Design a binder for this molecule. Structure first.
Ligand SMILES: CO[C@@H]1[C@@H](OC(N)=O)[C@@H](O)[C@H](Oc2ccc3c(O)c(NC(=O)[C@]45C[C@H]6C[C@H](C[C@H](C6)C4)C5)c(=O)oc3c2C)OC1(C)C
Ligand SMILES: Nc1ncnc2c1ncn2[C@@H]1O[C@H](COP(=O)(O)OP(=O)(O)O)[C@@H](O)[C@H]1O
Ligand SMILES: [Mg+2]
Length: 240
């Protein structure tokens, strides 16, 4: 499949926080939306996922324009989303968190739902936390349950808003291998980050945003031909 956002634009109280941001993620790809803080990354995600409405632009998946469809409708069309902050249910166990979203899987019965729940706990290495409350999980364990909870909805595209935020240096390399696994499974992965040097390497293509505008895009090799981006990458310039 193909998820495409074309020239999105969003404004809050007269201030246009996102002028013109465009991106495209295909199945079997890891596309990045990189840029400094306050550039418009999260606002772009809310427009693609459908949390906040769009002022201008289009959100298209394959031959369907889903720009005026609410969140739940785009969720049933293949879009999965994970926030930057903690989105786990802290008062429920890991098993109860996965069975939560599996309750919307009408394509499965009560037996297959609990089957996939065990399949998702072995895949993300959280079998030893089946009955553990979400509050007792560390930063890295919380994310892997949060990601597996999104995968339980069986999406076509998974959108991670800075997934490496608030996790130990051993969990980032753990989530990075989880991302490369989802890509090989046919999903389209879309991640955001402010660290451009560390995240650009795993991106087949990336879209560099700055103050609501798109300053560069393409594969990392094509992006790192923009002199302004090379300076921030090599360390010659401070602000991107
Ligand atoms: C169909 O409904 C499903 C449920 O049913 C199933 N399986 O389908 C299930 O999926 C799940 O239900 C929930 C979801 C969330 C909570 C939850 O946030 C609680 N705790 C906190 O909010 C706090 C506790 C502390 C720590 C922080 C800040 C502050 C103080 C408040 C979190 C809570 O105690 O209970 C929840 C339950 C039962 O989500 C639903 C409602 C969509
Ligand atoms: N709900 C909101 N109301 C007002 N201003 C907002 C709102 N959400 C984001 N902004 C502003 O837009 C920019 C944030 O874009 P965000 O994409 O949320 O930053 P990042 O790109 O780090 O996610 C900042 O200027 C922030 O103050
Ligand atoms: Mg953000």
């Amino acid at each position: 499949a193909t998820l495409t956002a074309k020239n999105l634009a969003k404004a809050y109280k007269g201030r246009r926080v996102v002028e013109d941001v465009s991106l495209t993620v295909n199945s079997g790809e890891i596309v990045g939306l990189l840029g400094p803080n306050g550039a418009g990354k999260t606002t772009t995600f809310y427009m693609v996922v459908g949390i906040v409405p769009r002022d201008a632009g289009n959100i298209i998946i394959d031959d369907d324009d889903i720009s005026l469809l609410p969140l739940h409708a785009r969720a049933r069309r293949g879009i999965g989303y994970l926030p930057q902050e903690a989105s786990i249910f802290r008062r429920l166990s890991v098993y109860d968190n996965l069975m939560a979203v599996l309750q919307i899987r009408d394509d499965l019965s009560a037996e297959q739902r609990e089957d996939r729940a065990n399949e998702l706990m072995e895949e993300f290495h959280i079998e030893h936390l089946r009955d553990s409350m979400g509050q007792s999980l560390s930063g890295g364990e919380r994310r892997r349950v949060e990601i597996a909870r999104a995968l339980a909805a069986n999406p076509k595209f998974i959108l991670l808003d800075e997934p490496f935020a608030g996790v130990d240096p051993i969990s980032v390399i753990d989530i990075k291998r989880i991302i490369e696994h989802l890509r090989d499974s046919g999903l389209g992965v879309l991640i955001t980050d402010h660290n451009v040097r560390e995240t650009l390497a795993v991106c087949e293509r990336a879209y560099i945003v700055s103050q609501g505008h798109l300053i560069a895009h393409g594969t990392p090799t094509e992006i790192l031909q923009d002199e302004h981006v090379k300076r921030v990458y090599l360390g010659e310039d401070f602000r991107l």
